[PDB]
Scaffold this active site. Structure first.
Site, mmCIF file in Angstrom:
data_model
loop_
_atom_site.group_PDB
_atom_site.id
_atom_site.type_symbol
_atom_site.label_atom_id
_atom_site.label_comp_id
_atom_site.label_asym_id
_atom_site.label_seq_id
_atom_site.Cartn_x
_atom_site.Cartn_y
_atom_site.Cartn_z
ATOM 1 C CB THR E 1 28.778 28.744 42.926
ATOM 2 O OG1 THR E 1 29.705 29.403 42.054
ATOM 3 C CG2 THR E 1 29.320 28.785 44.352
ATOM 4 C CG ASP E 17 30.999 24.176 43.463
ATOM 5 O OD1 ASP E 17 31.116 24.498 42.262
ATOM 6 O OD2 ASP E 17 30.568 24.959 44.338
ATOM 7 N NE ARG E 19 32.725 22.945 36.184
ATOM 8 C CZ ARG E 19 32.045 22.169 35.343
ATOM 9 N NH1 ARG E 19 30.795 22.466 35.011
ATOM 10 N NH2 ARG E 19 32.620 21.090 34.829
ATOM 11 C CE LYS E 33 33.172 27.683 43.817
ATOM 12 N NZ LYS E 33 32.038 27.218 42.974
ATOM 13 N N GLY E 47 28.253 33.712 44.387
ATOM 14 C CA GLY E 47 28.033 34.978 43.693
ATOM 15 C C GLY E 47 29.300 35.489 43.038
ATOM 16 C CB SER E 129 24.855 28.403 39.949
ATOM 17 O OG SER E 129 24.261 28.082 38.703
ATOM 18 C CG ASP E 166 24.167 24.688 38.315
ATOM 19 O OD1 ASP E 166 23.395 25.289 37.538
ATOM 20 O OD2 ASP E 166 25.127 25.247 38.884
ATOM 21 C CB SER E 169 28.219 23.227 40.612
ATOM 22 O OG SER E 169 27.476 24.333 41.087
#
Lengths: 233, 204, 238, 201, 220, 239, 233, 248, 196
Positions: E1, E17, E19, E33, E47, E129, E166, E169
């Site tokens: 995230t 994002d 994902r 999101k 989270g 993340s 990352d 994501s």
């Protein structure tokens, strides 16, 4: 320190009538006139908003109140009691939206609001509401018009009148109402049936009108009222 | 693992104007198989189904409590429930038990009444809905089901082609899972008919 | 007539009738005399009987080692108030390890009896008490009423026909301070004798005495224990 | 601790020791383990000393009120169920007991085994305690339904004695009780040391 | 995230994002999101996914109730205080990391709200993340009072940095631009990643699955 | 919560609220019950069934347990509440005590329930009397009756409801060892008692019998008419 | 209409004073205290010969050493006796001893004025107990007899009578009782006073008798055991 | 506090309840509602009081409520208090379905609401519900059933019953034409129109003023439907011509 | 440790349970009954914790009997199985859960013979044959081999005997006596105890 009564104030008479509700229906009858008309294309709600003293700020407090993006309310009778019913209707509309993620149906809101009005006719140490409600809404490709009285009953209407000279309004409406009316033509007859019992020449500050359609419910601006008000649009 | 105690797998798939839902039939405690005929897919309104995978208790408890809230909804309102409405109803039911949830992952599959549109979604144990246009899977062999669906699924599929896709996506994914098996039941939902098939699967 | 139903209802004169009606309950009960010296506090109470075949009612109750009471009015309201007085004395001795002063305890009664006189549905305590106690300040005689108002007195008598006892204590009030234990008890029963008519007088069966002070703890005297106090009397005046 | 109870033709025999231990150290050897609930009901002490004493006394309280209300004596099946229901409310909290409720009922001689865990079973013979395993051995070897009154005393008295010989937590004195139709009676309170001379000679 | 927000001359640009993962496996390729709060305030989420949705919907419900009673547009500080006081009351058990941003009568206001209840008012914030990758882009290329299209480029590069670096994501980049008069909700702004189309068809032929029992139920 | 005191004392030392509930039971249908040697039988009359009404639902005879049954008079809405509360106690007694419920114990519970509603705040007394019928574990026949006040008494033969005094006086001069000797003769005593007040006996009488080992038996109208015909034949013999 | 805790101009509660009037309607009961023991006698008052005489029990035991006779509203008494039976067992459980007769009577006297509307529990009393009780038992101080009334005023008695004809029976007990009489004389005297005040003649199935003595427990006189004292008419 | 109290849960010197009997008067002023039992099915017929030219008509019915998959009810009295009781009946029926996984028997659901209505007459110090209900349904125990409820909390099973305005005259009219054991749904509807036409205030009788709902078991499942405006008019003209045929 | 076994036929239900009530290492009772009479045609086979067995089985037993008295008719085997599941499922996440693995057997007037398997977590499952305990691991395989949907009651007891003999041969715990009961159209019938 306070206690609170647990006994009902509304009781059955020897004749078989709930006396407190009968007098609550008399409180709305002596209130400001209000009308509602369904026209298939949309719903129109109009009410008498007489300030009397001119010192009053007209735009400060509204009689026509929105509950959600597609539902509005108009009343007759007591102001303070109506305002509590608005907040309760607004809260019940949000509680439905949090659970189902779908805008509340008009008929479903009325059923929940009427249950609150029924509660005050049976609960301990409380009087019934002295307000009759006019609920408009748009859902499922159909416009809706409902009436909620002090008792807690609800009726679906095509066109109805409230307040003073409501019997004169209802007889005027049934002569004036047609199937497949236009929304803009529905505002014309609504502002005209209110003029039946008004006496003191209508200005854009004297009455309040709200419309509901496919786009949603919104209160009409004094500029839009002024255009319709000069006899013709 | 709490989810791996009873096992199970639920799959849903989208077609052209049809929705398919498939689930295994095994009921067993840890390693020992108990019942061959166990219901995991439950009817919600003639053209809407829910498949529950996880703990066998919570599978039955949620289905019963959702039917409790479903019938009251259909009596208060003079209409049959919408797929988006049921999705939010399951999400609300599971979130009420946030700090002590039902160990089950619901999957809703069915057609939208009056508008004939397909709908699929899957939810978390605490109730987190997500909508897809292809497939949703839940269970112990989630990773096994993802590998089959990513290779077999096609955009526009007829009822007969969708049946062959969801059946092969289940059977092969189930056969690589120890806690899932003992027959696969498929419900193919159309606007005119509901076709129920029990597939020939491995019994080990 | 229309104001004498609840304690919450005020009279146009500025009175509460229900509290005044509760004051009449104390007058219905038999008379009791309470007096103090400089070292001792003595309660002398008259006992009543429903019939000559039945025993006489308890008029003096034990509260604590240094505090004792004599009740007049309702019996059930007397014991209910006594249990509160017993508990408050036990609470102070449990926490502070010292005998609770009388001035403190009587103030607690004036706080508890005030609550029901102001609330709807509740009633005042229809019992008058004469509280005898000894502490660091010396002997004490206190008077509590149906109204939360309490009195700190030198000598007091409440009950039926208690006016005759009230007049006698006033004429001999200056003698009590320098009076010894033996004679101070004789003054108490002599006032109690005046409440009774000309023909009947004090006997071993209808007289209870409660004595507390510096020398001894609160003790209630009954039938054969009251005889040394009665023997050596002045006899009834004509 | 060794408590045993068995029912036969003439009634119910109750037998118990008197040793109470606080670890390795012995606290008392004069513990009245046969708890006198009623003039018609008896109990046994095993596991927790206070747990057996308090709850059976609460039962003794409850059984007296039953006699005052219903004008009749309480049954052994009802007395066992009442104690089982009260202790069950505190399951998995820390209570430890292994009692046996004995008495003559309208149906006949009654014997029930009640636990702190929530067990309630009726049977012909039971033995509870740390040395109960040794008590079961000798008792079953010489048991008969047609046993004489004097022969029934010799079986239970020696059964506790043989258990005290092996179990370290059992000892003191062998207490014996006989339960008859009119009511129970106290039989003997023989010492283990005194009985040692009896079986040797 | 990877969620981010920036403050430019006219208003606020928010990024996210698409994902959503269950453990270390991608569950949803396209997930929203950026959440609706009010017709002027939007909020990004990170989270716990279920905690983010229900907390957002409750504040959005309360502010709609608030705006109708007042008769005027709600403030960002009102949205902030509601999220601040609730998350503190649960002592961080509701794992909701929210990047709040909107335009008021006072101006543009940006907030970063942590699950424990701590709030920070900054020109640029990153959470999730892949927040470390996204913050590095801001700490290198951010400048005060920048243009709308320049700010949109700044956030899109920040989200992309969290996407490729990352593992939490991935997929598409979502943007939300809120100004004093205009609100642009660009759902698919940039699609940097796509599936390499299947050249080998694995379509199962009609009648390749063995059927034991069949039952057909007609409908209306 | 409603805290107002309903049942209160009066200047003459009377409880009117209890007495008005005793006026409600008098207005109710006639209910009689006699205690025999081996069977106990109760019966209700003057039901005022309009024939177009289902007779199964409007039954005044209700079984509380496998050994205990009752018949009521007065406010029929108040009775169902008491009956259901009595049925729960029958199973609650079995959970606490392994032995089943005795006839006296269940009567004691109903009487205490009616007593609490005459002394508690905000509560109205029950306007019903109950004829508790059954057998003990010993096999001894029992008959009990309760009232709105909360007092219970054991009877050999008793009647409650409308014209209860007329039926009682009939049973005061008919209840003998010769009349309650056999099973068939005990039932005849019930019908003779009801025909004293009820309008033209036949379809108005509803009675139920119970044996020493067998459960409650509700006799159908076809069986009642068989006994009624036998009563008139014995009545014809004299004149 | 007034509340339950209302004081009269005289200086007493109405509900308490009306409860004393309720006792004057109930059956008469005579209790006599003697050095050899306490006896209790009461009339059962059978309305119809069909009713079982063994069912009516106006004398009931609290413990093995205490018995009590009741008058007035029998339904209200059964609640008070049940409370007395529990209190004795609660004291036995805590102190491993038997309560004195004065202690038991005081425990019941605590529940006298525990009635009210406001500031009370949902399961609280609304009206006083219209029951006069005669607690007669033997303890450490010997045989004792106590009288209790709705007000809660409990007192010791040598000979006390309460019921319908209580005033007539009290004057008759004053002329017979002395300090040095025997238990057999106390049983004999109680029957003579009872047959004078009863509407119907004295019979073995008509009355109830019980004695408490230092020698043995509370004993209820059976139909056969009564015949020995009934024969002395 | 006690001065303003009307004492609803109290007894009368006669031995009756005032607030219940006064509530019973409110039903007698409401619309006429009747229901009769047949061999193949069971139906309810009600007089619609909400008759106006400007009435919108949105809901399926005015006074007929659906409670279960196998059960339906009708209302006579206050419509306001009825919406609370009918909603409660739906809850109880679903509590039983959750617990036992079976449809609630007809007698069990009626007794459940009657316990609530009896509770309001005994304690709480509140006014009783002024609604009398008629229940129709099917269960695996007795089959097709008909019930009637009172404000006091009293119920009863009927073969043919009526409640509301002119109920006493209607129940005697039902007592005349009803043949026990040999009644079909076809003759049941003809009887329902016959009674309503004579007992109603305004003569002639139109389909817009009446409301009929039928309950019949079909192909292993219960079917509950409210009759169409064209279906009712067909039943009226069959009766109208039958009454004209009497003059011969 | 405790053991259960149930076999369903075309018109009957056969159920069996061990008569051993064991503590630590000793057998306290020789003739322990683990069958609870719910109705005239319904039996409950309760096995699990020390106190949870008697308390839970009797609670449901009295509630089923309460339904009988209040209505006149008895509960169906299907309705009784869903009722006992509801009480266990609601108590699962409460402070006091019941750790009991039960088996319900009943005959219906319309639907016929029925057998229900239920876990301690409250998971109801309809099965033609089911078994509880450690002895189930040795007996279920024999029940998978010789079982037929159209099995006669004389063959069902013979099939039951084959499974009980496996417990005498392989199973480490001593279980000598077994209670055998058959439920059919006439009700519950007690059969001769198979002892070794």
């Amino acid at each position: 320190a306070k206690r609170g009564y647990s006994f009902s104030l509304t009781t059955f008479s020897p004749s078989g009538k709930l006396v407190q509700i009968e007098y609550a229906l008399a409180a709305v009858a002596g209130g400001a006139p209000s009308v509602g008309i369904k026209a298939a294309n949309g719903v129109v709600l109009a009410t008498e908003k007489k300030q009397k003293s001119i010192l009053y700020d007209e735009r400060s407090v509204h009689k026509v109140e929105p509950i959600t993006k597609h539902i509005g309310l108009v009343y007759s009778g007591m102001g303070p009691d109506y305002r509590v019913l608005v907040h309760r209707a607004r809260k019940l509309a949000q509680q439905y939206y949090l659970v189902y993620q779908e805008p509340i149906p008009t008929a479903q809101l009325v059923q929940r609001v009427a249950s609150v009005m029924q509660e005050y006719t049976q609960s301990g140490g409380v009087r019934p509401f002295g307000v009759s409600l006019l609920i408009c809404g748009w859902n499922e490709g159909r416009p809706y018009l409902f009436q909620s009285d002090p008792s807690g009953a609800y009726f679906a209407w095509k066109a109805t009148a409230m307040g003073k000279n409501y019997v004169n309004g209802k007889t005027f409406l049934e002569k004036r109402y047609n199937e497949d009316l236009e929304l803009e033509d529905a505002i014309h007859t609504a502002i005209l049936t209110l003029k039946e019992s008004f006496e003191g020449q209508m200005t854009e500050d004297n009455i309040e009108v709200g419309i509901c359609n496919e786009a949603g419910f919104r209160r009409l601006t004094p500029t839009e009222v002024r255009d319709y008000l000069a006899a013709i649009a | 693992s709490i989810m791996s105690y009873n096992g199970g797998a639920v799959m849903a798939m989208k077609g052209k104007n049809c929705v398919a839902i498939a689930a295994d039939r095994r009921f067993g405690i840890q390693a020992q198989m108990v019942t061959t005929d166990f219901q995991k897919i439950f009817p919600m309104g003639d053209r809407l189904y829910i498949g529950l995978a996880g703990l066998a208790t919570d599978v039955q408890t949620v289905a019963q409590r959702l039917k409790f809230r479903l019938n009251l909804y259909e009596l208060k309102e003079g209409r049959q429930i919408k797929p988006y409405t049921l999705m939010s109803m399951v999400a609300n039911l599971l979130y009420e038990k946030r700090f002590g949830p039902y160990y089950t992952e619901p999957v809703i599959a069915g057609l939208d009444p009056k508008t004939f549109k397909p709908f699929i979604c899957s939810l978390d144990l605490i109730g987190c809905p997500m909508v897809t246009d292809d497939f949703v899977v839940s269970g112990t062999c989630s990773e096994q089901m993802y590998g089959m669906c990513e290779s077999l699924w096609e955009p526009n599929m007829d009822p007969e082609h969708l049946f062959e896709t969801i059946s092969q996506a289940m059977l092969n994914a189930v056969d690589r899972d120890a806690v899932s098996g003992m027959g696969v039941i498929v419900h193919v939902i159309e606007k005119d008919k509901i076709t129920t098939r029990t597939l020939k699967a491995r019994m080990d | 007539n229309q104001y004498d139903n609840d304690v919450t209802v005020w009279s146009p004169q500025g009175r509460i009738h229900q509290i005044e009606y509760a004051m009449e309950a104390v007058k219905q009960g038999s008379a009791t005399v309470g007096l103090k010296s400089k070292t001792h506090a003595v309660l002398v109470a008259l006992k009543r009987a429903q019939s000559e075949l039945a025993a006489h009612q308890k008029k003096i109750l034990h509260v604590d080692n240094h505090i004792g009471i004599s009740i007049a009015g309702l019996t059930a309201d007397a014991r209910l108030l006594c249990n509160f007085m017993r508990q408050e004395c036990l609470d102070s001795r449990f926490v502070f390890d010292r005998p609770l002063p009388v001035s403190r305890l009587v103030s607690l009664i004036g706080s508890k009896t005030q609550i029901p006189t102001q609330r709807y549905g509740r009633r005042p305590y229809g019992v008058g008490l004469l509280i005898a106690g000894y502490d660091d300040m010396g002997p004490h005689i206190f008077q509590t009423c149906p109204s939360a108002n309490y009195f700190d007195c030198r000598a007091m008598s409440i009950g039926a026909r208690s006016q005759s006892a009230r007049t006698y204590l006033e004429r001999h009030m200056s003698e009590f301070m320098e009076c010894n234990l033996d004679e101070l008890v004789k003054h108490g029963l002599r006032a109690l004798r005046e409440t009774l008519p000309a023909e009947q007088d004090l006997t071993t069966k209808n007289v209870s005495i409660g004595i507390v002070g510096k020398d001894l703890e609160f003790t209630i005297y009954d039938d054969d224990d009251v005889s040394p106090f009665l023997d050596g009397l002045e006899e009834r005046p004509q | 601790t060794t408590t045993l109870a068995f029912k036969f033709l003439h009634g119910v025999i109750v037998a118990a020791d008197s040793r109470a231990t606080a670890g390795a150290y012995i606290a008392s050897q004069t513990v009245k383990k046969v708890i006198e609930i009623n003039p018609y009901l008896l109990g046994t002490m095993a596991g927790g000393a206070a747990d057996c004493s308090f709850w059976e006394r609460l039962l003794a309280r409850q059984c007296r009120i039953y006699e005052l209300r219903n004008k009749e004596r309480i049954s052994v099946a009802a007395a066992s169920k009442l104690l089982a229901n009260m202790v069950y409310q505190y399951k998995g909290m820390g209570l430890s007991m292994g009692t046996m409720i004995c008495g003559w009922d309208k149906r006949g001689p009654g014997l029930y085994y009640v636990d702190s865990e929530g067990n309630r079973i009726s049977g012909t013979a039971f033995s509870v305690g740390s040395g109960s395993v040794y008590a079961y051995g000798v008792m079953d070897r010489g048991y008969s339904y047609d046993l004489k009154v004097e022969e029934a005393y010799d079986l239970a008295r020696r059964a506790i004695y043989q258990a005290t010989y092996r179990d370290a937590y059992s000892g003191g004195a062998v207490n014996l009780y006989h339960v008859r139709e009119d009511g129970w009676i106290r039989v003997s309170s023989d010492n283990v040391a005194d009985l040692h001379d009896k079986y040797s000679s | 995230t990877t969620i981010a927000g920036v403050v430019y001359k006219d208003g606020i640009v928010l990024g996210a994002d698409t994902r959503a993962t269950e453990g270390m496996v991608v569950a949803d390729k396209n997930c929203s999101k950026i959440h609706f709060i009010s017709p002027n305030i939007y909020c990004c989420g990170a989270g716990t996914a279920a905690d983010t949705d229900m907390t957002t919907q409750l504040i959005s419900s309360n502010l709609e109730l608030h705006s109708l009673t007042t008769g005027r547009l709600p403030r960002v500080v009102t949205a902030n205080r509601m999220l601040k006081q609730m998350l503190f009351r649960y002592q961080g058990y509701i794992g909701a990391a929210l990047v709040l941003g909107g335009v008021d009568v006072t101006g543009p206001h940006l907030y970063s709200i942590y699950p424990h209840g701590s709030t920070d008012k900054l020109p640029y914030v990153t959470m999730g993340s892949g927040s470390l990758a996204a913050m590095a882009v801001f700490e290198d290329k951010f400048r005060p009072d920048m243009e709308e299209e320049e700010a949109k480029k700044l956030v899109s590069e920040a989200i992309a940095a969290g996407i490729f670096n990352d593992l939490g994501s991935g997929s598409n980049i979502d943007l939300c631009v809120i100004s004093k008069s205009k609100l642009d909700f660009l759902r698919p702004f940039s699609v940097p990643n796509k599936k390499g189309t299947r050249l080998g068809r694995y379509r199962c032929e009609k009648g390749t699955t063995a059927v034991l029992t069949e039952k057909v139920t007609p409908l209306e | 919560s409603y805290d107002r005191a309903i049942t209160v004392f009066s200047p003459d030392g009377h409880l009117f609220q209890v007495e008005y509930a005793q006026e409600a039971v008098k207005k109710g249908s006639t209910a009689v019950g006699v205690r025999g040697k081996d069977i106990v039988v109760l019966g209700v009359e003057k039901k005022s069934v309009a024939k177009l009404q289902d007779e199964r639902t409007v039954r005044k005879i209700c079984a509380l347990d496998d050994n205990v049954c009752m018949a009521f008079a007065g406010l029929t809405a108040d009775a169902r509440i008491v009956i259901n509360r009595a049925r729960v106690e029958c199973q609650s007694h079995r959970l606490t005590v392994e032995d089943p419920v005795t006839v006296e114990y269940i009567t004691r519970y109903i009487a205490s329930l009616k007593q609490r509603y005459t002394q508690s705040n905000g509560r109205r007394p029950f306007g019903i009397s109950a004829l508790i019928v059954g057998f003990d574990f010993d096999g001894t026949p029992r008959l009990y009756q309760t009232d709105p006040s909360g007092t219970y008494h054991a009877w050999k033969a008793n009647a409650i409801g409308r014209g209860a005094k007329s039926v009682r006086e009939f049973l005061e001069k008919n209840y003998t060892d010769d009349a309650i000797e056999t099973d068939d003769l005990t039932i005849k005593l019930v019908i003779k008692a009801l025909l004293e007040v009820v309008q033209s006996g036949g379809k108005n009488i509803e009675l139920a019998v119970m044996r020493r080992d067998q459960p409650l038996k509700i006799l159908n109208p076809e069986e009642i008419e068989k006994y009624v015909a036998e009563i008139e034949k014995e009545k014809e013999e004299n004149e | 209409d007034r509340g339950v805790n209302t004081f009269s101009p005289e200086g007493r509660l109405f509900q308490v004073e009306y409860a004393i009037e309720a006792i004057k309607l109930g059956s008469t009961a005579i209790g006599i205290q003697t050095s050899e023991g306490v006896c209790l006698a009461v009339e059962k008052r059978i309305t119809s010969p069909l009713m079982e005489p063994s069912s009516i029990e106006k004398i009931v035991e609290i413990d093995a050493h205490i018995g009590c006779a009741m008058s007035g509203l029998i339904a209200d008494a059964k609640t008070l006796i049940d409370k007395a039976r529990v209190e004795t067992q609660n004291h036995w459980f805590t102190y491993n001893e038997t309560m004195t007769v004065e202690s038991v009577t005081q425990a019941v006297s605590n529940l006298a004025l525990q009635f009210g509307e406001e500031d009370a529990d949902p399961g609280a009393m609304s009206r006083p107990f219209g029951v006069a009780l005669l607690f007669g038992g033997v303890d450490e101080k010997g045989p004792q007899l106590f009288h209790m009334d709705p007000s809660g005023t409990f007192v010791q008695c040598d000979a006390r009578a309460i019921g319908s004809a209580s005033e007539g029976a009290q004057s008759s007990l004053q002329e017979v009782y002395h300090k040095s009489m025997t238990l057999k004389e106390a049983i004999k005297s109680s029957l003579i006073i009872l047959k004078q005040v009863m509407e119907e003649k004295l019979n073995a199935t008509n009355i109830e008798l019980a004695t408490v003595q230092p020698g043995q427990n509370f004993h209820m006189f059976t139909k056969e055991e009564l015949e020995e004292v009934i024969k002395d008419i | 506090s006690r001065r303003y109290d009307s004492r609803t849960t109290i007894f009368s010197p006669e031995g009756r309840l005032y607030q219940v009997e006064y509530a019973m008067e409110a039903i007698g002023h409401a619309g006429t509602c009747l229901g009769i039992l047949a061999n193949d099915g069971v139906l309810l017929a009600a007089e619609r009081r909400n008759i106006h030219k400007l009435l919108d008509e949105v809901f399926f019915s005015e006074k007929i409520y659906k409670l279960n998959e196998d059960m339906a009810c009708s209302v006579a009295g206050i419509t306001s208090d009825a919406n609370v009781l009918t909603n409660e009946l739906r809850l109880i029926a679903q509590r039983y379905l959750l617990q036992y996984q079976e449809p609630i028997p007809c007698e069990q659901l009626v007794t459940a609401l009657c316990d609530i209505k009896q509770a309001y007459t005994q304690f709480g110090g509140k006014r009783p519900f002024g609604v009398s209900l008629l229940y129709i349904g099917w269960d695996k125990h007795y089959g097709f059933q008909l019930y009637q409820s009172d404000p006091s909390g009293n119920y009863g099973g009927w073969k043919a019953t009526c409640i509301g305005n002119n109920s006493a005259a209607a129940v005697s009219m039902l007592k005349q034409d009803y043949k026990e054991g040999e009644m079909t749904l076809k003759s049941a509807l003809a009887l329902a129109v016959k009674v309503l036409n004579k007992t109603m205030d305004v003569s002639k009788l139109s389909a817009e003023k009446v409301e009929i709902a039928t309950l019949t078991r079909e192909s292993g499942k219960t079917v509950i439907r409210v009759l169409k405006q064209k279906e009712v008019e067909q039943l009226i003209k069959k009766h109208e011509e039958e009454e004209a045929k009497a003059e011969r | 440790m405790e053991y259960l076994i149930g076999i369903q036929g075309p018109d009957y239900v056969l159920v069996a349970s061990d008569r051993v009530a064991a503590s630590n290492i000793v057998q306290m009772k020789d003739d322990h009954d683990k069958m609870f009479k719910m109705s005239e045609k319904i039996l409950l086979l309760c096995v699990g914790e020390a106190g949870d067995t008697v308390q839970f089985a009797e609670y449901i037993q009295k509630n089923v009997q309460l339904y009988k008295m209040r209505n006149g008719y008895e509960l169906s085997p299907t309705a009784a199985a869903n009722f006992t599941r509801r009480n266990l499922a609601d108590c699962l996440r409460s402070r006091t859960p019941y750790h009991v693995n039960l088996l319900l057997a009943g005959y219906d007037e319309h639907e016929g013979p029925a057998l229900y398997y239920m876990d301690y977590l409250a998971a109801l499952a309809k099965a033609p044959f089911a078994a509880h305990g450690y002895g189930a691991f040795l007996t279920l395989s024999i029940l998978d081999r010789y079982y037929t949907p159209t099995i006669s009651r004389e063959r069902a007891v013979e099939l039951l005997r084959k499974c009980l003999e496996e417990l005498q041969k392989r199973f480490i715990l001593n279980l000598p006596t077994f209670s055998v009961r058959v439920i059919d159209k006439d009700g519950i019938h007690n059969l001769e105890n198979i002892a070794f």
